[PDB]
Design a protein around this nucleic acid. Structure first.
Ligand code: FES
Ligand SMILES: [K+]
Ligand SMILES: [Mg+2]
Ligand SMILES: [Mg+2]
Ligand SMILES: [Mg+2]
Ligand SMILES: [Mg+2]
Ligand SMILES: [Mg+2]
Ligand SMILES: [Zn+2]
Lengths: 294, 126, 170, 74, 53, 108, 197, 54
RNA sequence: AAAGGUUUGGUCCUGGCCUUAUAAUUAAUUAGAGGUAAAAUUACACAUGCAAACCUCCAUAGACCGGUGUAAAAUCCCUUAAACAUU
């Protein structure tokens, strides 16, 4: 079977990086944090261009996309059932192995319940206790209150989606249900309000386009990419959609006509586009502006 | 102090404040003060239920195994913790005490039934 | 104004810029240089600029310097095995001398990194204790755990004063 | 706590031991639990003692230990 | 340093004390004698435990 | 004087004599003989670039030479011969400051 | 004993947009035109504990206390912004604005609560995921093969359960501790008896 | 058998190292067998009481 | 230190003293409750009670915990060897 493309596939990372874009001014926007007096260097045009190159190298490492994973499966394993200890304790004991050189997902965290059952700690219990003994800067032991739907909607009204996602990465694990819930809610709000520009030149753009492709709702991103004159991006998105859905009518139509460039986007409109009429209109208007002006 | 004689032991060192106990599992020479000089800290024990109702024990099982392999004795409270965790077998007195509690509650239940039967006799008298 | 010439040499940041960390075999480094001449200029700068940095990173190595004893400047290292490594530094820049000694008798970056990690093996984040040694002194500081009675009064039922009263009442 | 050179208390001259009373059924069961419990813990303490000595020998004279020593000399 | 000075009395005391112990060693007939009326050892005045009476 | 000029963020230390006239004459003397970034680019012919720790490695060009940009890199000595003030350096050497230093004060 | 009653108690944010606020304060912070009265040039490192005691106001009420309509609430973000550094995002210490220690604590809690609910913006650093590897196939997070005793339902070790002593051994103990014995106990209840209530 | 947690840690290590087996970890008690508590002890190394009378 | 006050008929320089900040003890005046921490004139003399036992005899322990800052430039850090009244 032809393997389903992955998020980390070298081809997917190429396309997702391209559509995301780069902007040294947005990637290195000044942080509102304690400040220090700036330093100054006299540089030639050769040295200045070299410095810009290193800045673009850092912007690449800065824009590294966070993992997109499937929801973890509940841990429900009972190590022992010592019924002799039933009724001798009122509160659960949680035992955490805190050996330094063990990966956190390979640590043994067990719970001795009042009934006497010795079981493995659940996912929510595992993450809480690992914060208490291996604290991570940015993460809190108890789930914050900013992730509540009412609080999240407030952040969306202020157009603070990149923060909602940066907070979701410091707090929750990539495979946790809360992580997937918050990300899918942020991506969904961007679509309805056409706020795709907020996450451009950010590490969160790749996951957003991935989510739309898998959910077959790239229509809005194509319309918005075209209206911003980013039609190379729109074509690459249609390539990614024809890669993760090979047996789709749209992918089979592009093979029949050997479509390339702007042709690929036109094929998508007729075949699988939820709102094909608008993609053609925006694509047509773009062609008219380009042809008329140049 | 300059001790002469004694052995290394794994025990609980009491910390915290009044009515708020907190324990540090440590490996220390047995003659040292309870909260004084130790060799290594091997974990912690919080005996008070937290917001989720969980008493939290942390055990550095790699260092604990190291010090038991070098002759370190265990205090009876620490042997009870290792038994509840599953790293050691349940201590004999953990089982015996649980059996005593079972025999003691059986008497209480029987006495209540006898009292209820005596109360039933009062109901019969009316 | 800091006294002397090139007062930057007497700053901790400058002293820490030295990169030559000798191998454990190195025990002594005798420096023979001439105060007058043209082919010994690099050696004079090496004594002026580099010897402080070398000593700072190698506190246990004996650096003894001799002046105007030979026609040409040279460096001779004495190793613990008994070997003597002679280096000729005439017509060589001070930077060139530092790079030469680093190659032949300097520890590699990989070796130095491993030692740093080993030094910190016994520090654990989960460990509780004084600020000098640990992040948190008590579990009361942790979020969700019962707070310290001093900061937050405990519930009456969790207090010995209250419990003792009930036992008398019983 | 008192030193060996301190005088004994006068309120405690009368003291004599009062050994606890023994339940035959539970005393015997408990004696067997201690024997079997201490056997298991001695087997585990021995296994822990071997991991300590194995790990120490690997570091002192393991494959990796020997190669690095000659690599430095070369 | 060099202001730490010998302690002749301390050295003399240790040796002298140890010698007396060897000279005046007790015998089993004295250390383990017993008074059967009180079940107490006369040497040390150590009363035997109850389960041994 | 700084409020009269419009300077909002600065540090200064005054030592020696506290003569008010000499402090005002010396203050204006120094503030009027400073060198703007645009001036420095013209004198040396090179770009003046700025590196902020809150902006990462992003190079910020604050002044470009008015005429011809040079191609000879400015000499960077291995060890500079700058004359350093003990007062500035002493802090970074880990020496304890006075109890009067950096006290909490009202907004200026 | 009659402190004035603010009309904006329910909606504190309204005051900061009203014409009355603009006339009194303009576009400068509410602490701009406040000065503290103290001996010496170096001021005390703490401000006064509180400006209001039992409906009485102190001589020089602090910026918050002097204006009763000003309300320190997490929803009144425009007021809270004035007490946070725009460039560094650090809350100013009490001497900086001259607020009393009581209101400074109240302001700090309101700012912290406003940030937690997202009403007041702050800088979120970018942090990498916790784990280098995200596999969940280790036994700790997976299913361990059930032990033979667990499948059968037996105790983990045989001595965990009560094993009736042999009759000869019970007699051996009755002789050894003759005269200091307790009533012999039989097998304990199979389960924990439900607590009588 | 091994204690419940210590048995799970052994089986988990097996899978990590690629050792595939359903063998049950077992402790060997032969090497560490305890004498009875009343077993005669070594008199040669035992202490003797001092010669100071009370 | 972000400094200020004070030499003179007056100015500049030099220079000390003092003020403003922070904390501990004692004292004057004054004082509701609750939680927590700490408790401290004195190596001067001490009434009284208690602070080390356990345990089938042998042994083990009372060499610890607790207290004070006597003596002493007394030490820190490091190397080597050796035992251990030990496990
Ligand atoms: S310091 Fe943690 S309970 Fe008080
Ligand atoms: K003066
Ligand atoms: Mg015996
Ligand atoms: Mg004069
Ligand atoms: Mg007083
Ligand atoms: Mg002590
Ligand atoms: Mg003295
Ligand atoms: Zn106030």
């Amino acid at each position: 079977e032809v393997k389903k493309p992955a998020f980390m596939d070298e081809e997917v990372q190429r396309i997702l990086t391209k559509i995301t874009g780069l902007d040294l001014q947005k990637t290195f926007r000044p942080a509102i944090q304690p400040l220090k007096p700036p330093t100054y260097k006299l540089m030639t045009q050769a040295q200045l261009e070299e410095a810009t190159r290193l800045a673009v190298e850092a912007a690449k490492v800065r824009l590294k996309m966070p993992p997109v994973l499937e929801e973890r499966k509940p841990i429900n394993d009972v190590l022992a059932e010592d019924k002799i200890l039933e009724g001798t304790e009122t509160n659960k004991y949680v035992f955490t192995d805190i050996s330094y050189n063990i990966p956190h997902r390979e640590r043994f965290i067990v719970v001795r319940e009042p009934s006497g059952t010795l079981r493995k700690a659940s996912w929510e219990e595992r993450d809480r206790v690992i914060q208490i003994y291996f604290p991570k800067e940015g993460r809190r032991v108890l789930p914050p209150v900013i992730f509540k739907d009412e609080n999240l909607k407030t952040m969306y009204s202020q157009d603070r989606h990149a923060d909602v996602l940066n907070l979701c990465v410091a707090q929750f694990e990539p495979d946790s249900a809360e992580y997937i819930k918050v990300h899918h809610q942020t991506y969904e709000d961007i679509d309805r309000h056409g706020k795709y520009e907020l996450l451009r030149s950010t590490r969160h753009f790749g996951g957003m386009a991935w989510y739309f492709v898998n959910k077959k709702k790239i229509d809005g991103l194509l319309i918005d990419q075209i209206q911003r004159d980013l039609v190379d991006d729109a074509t690459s998105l249609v390539q990614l959609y024809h890669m993760l859905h090979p047996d789709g009518q749209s992918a089979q139509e592009a093979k029949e006509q050997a479509a390339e460039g702007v042709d690929l986007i036109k094929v998508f409109a007729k075949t699988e586009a939820q709102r094909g009429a608008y993609i053609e209109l925006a694509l047509q208007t773009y062609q008219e502006i380009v042809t008329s002006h140049s | 102090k300059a001790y002469h004689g004694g052995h290394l032991t794994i025990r609980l060192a009491l910390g915290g404040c009044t009515n708020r106990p907190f324990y540090r599992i440590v490996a220390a020479h047995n003659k040292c003060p309870r909260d004084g000089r130790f060799v290594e800290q091997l974990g912690s024990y919080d005996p008070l239920p937290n917001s989720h109702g969980e008493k939290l024990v942390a055990l550095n099982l790699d260092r604990i195994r190291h010090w038991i392999g070098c002759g370190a004795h265990l205090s009876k409270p620490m042997e009870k913790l290792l038994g509840l965790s599953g790293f050691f077998p349940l201590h004999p007195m953990m089982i015996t005490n649980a059996e005593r509690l079972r025999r003691r509650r059986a008497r209480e239940v029987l006495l209540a039934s006898q009292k209820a039967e005596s109360e039933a006799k009062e109901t019969e008298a009316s | 104004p800091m006294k002397g010439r090139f007062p930057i040499r007497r700053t901790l940041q400058y002293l820490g810029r030295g990169d030559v960390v000798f191998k454990e075999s190195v025990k002594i480094m005798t420096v023979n240089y001439n105060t007058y001449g043209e082919l010994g200029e690099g050696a004079r700068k090496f004594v002026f600029f580099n010897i402080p940095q070398i000593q700072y990173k190698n506190p246990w190595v004996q650096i003894m310097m001799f002046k105007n004893m030979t026609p040409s400047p040279f460096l001779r290292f004495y190793l613990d095995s008994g070997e003597q490594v002679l280096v000729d530094v005439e017509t060589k820049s001070n930077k060139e001398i530092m790079e030469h000694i680093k190659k032949i008798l300097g520890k590699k970056e990989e070796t130095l990194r491993e030692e740093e990690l080993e030094k910190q093996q016994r520090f654990h984040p989960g460990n509780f204790g004084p600020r000098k040694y640990c992040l948190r002194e008590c579990m009361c500081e942790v979020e969700g755990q019962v707070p310290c009675p001093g900061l937050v009064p405990l519930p009456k039922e969790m207090t010995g004063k209250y419990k003792a009263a009930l036992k008398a009442s019983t | 706590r008192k030193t060996r050179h301190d005088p004994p208390a006068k309120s405690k001259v009368g003291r004599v031991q009062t050994p606890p009373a023994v339940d035959p059924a539970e005393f015997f069961v408990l004696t067997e639990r201690y024997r079997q419990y201490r056997e298991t813990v001695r087997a585990l303490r021995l296994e822990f003692t071997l991991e300590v000595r194995r790990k120490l020998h690997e570091a002192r004279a393991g494959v990796l230990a020997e190669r690095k020593a000659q690599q430095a000399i070369t | 340093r060099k202001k730490v000075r010998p302690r002749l009395i301390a050295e003399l005391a240790r040796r002298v004390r140890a010698l007396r112990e060897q000279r005046n060693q007790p015998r089993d007939s004295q250390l383990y004698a017993l008074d059967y009326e009180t079940l107490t050892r006369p040497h040390s005045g150590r009363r035997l435990p109850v389960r041994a009476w | 004087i700084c409020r009269l000029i419009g300077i909002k963020d600065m540090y200064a230390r005054v030592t020696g004599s506290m003569n008010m006239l000499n402090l005002t004459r010396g203050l204006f003397h120094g503030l009027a003989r400073q060198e703007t970034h645009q001036h420095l680019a013209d004198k040396k012919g090179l770009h003046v670039v700025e590196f902020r720790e809150e902006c990462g490695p992003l190079p910020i060009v604050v002044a470009s030479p008015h005429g011809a940009l040079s191609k000879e890199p400015e000499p960077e000595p291995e060890v500079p011969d700058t004359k350093l003030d003990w007062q500035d350096v002493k802090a970074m050497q880990g020496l304890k400051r006075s109890v009067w230093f950096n006290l909490k004060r009202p907004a200026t | 004993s009659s402190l004035p009653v603010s009309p904006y108690e329910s909606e504190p944010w309204k005051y900061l947009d009203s014409e009355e606020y603009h006339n009194r304060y303009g576009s400068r912070p509410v602490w701009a035109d406040y000065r503290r009265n103290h001996k010496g040039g170096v001021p005390p490192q703490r401000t006064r504990k509180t400006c209001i005691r039992n409906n009485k106001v102190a001589g020089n009420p602090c910026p918050i206390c002097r204006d009763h309509k000003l309300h320190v609430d997490f929803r009144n973000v425009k007021l809270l912004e004035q007490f946070v550094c725009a460039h560094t995002g650090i809350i100013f210490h009490a001497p900086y604005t001259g607020v009393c220690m009581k209101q400074h604590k109240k302001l700090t809690q309101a700012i912290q609560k406003a940030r937690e609910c997202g009403l007041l913006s702050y800088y979120v650093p970018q942090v990498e995921p916790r784990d280098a590897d995200f596999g969940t196939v280790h036994g700790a997070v997976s299913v361990t093969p059930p032990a033979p005793t667990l499948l059968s339902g037996e105790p983990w070790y045989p001595w965990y359960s009560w094993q009736q002593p042999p009759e000869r051994e019970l007699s051996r103990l009755r002789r050894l501790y003759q005269g200091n014995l307790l009533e012999e106990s039989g097998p304990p209840p199979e389960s924990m008896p439900e607590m009588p209530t | 058998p091994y204690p419940p947690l210590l048995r799970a840690m052994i089986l988990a290590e097996r899978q990590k190292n690629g050792d595939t087996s359903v063998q049950e970890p077992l402790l060997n008690l032969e090497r560490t067998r305890m004498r009875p508590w009343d077993y005669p002890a070594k008199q040669e190394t035992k202490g003797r009481a001092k010669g100071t009378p009370v």
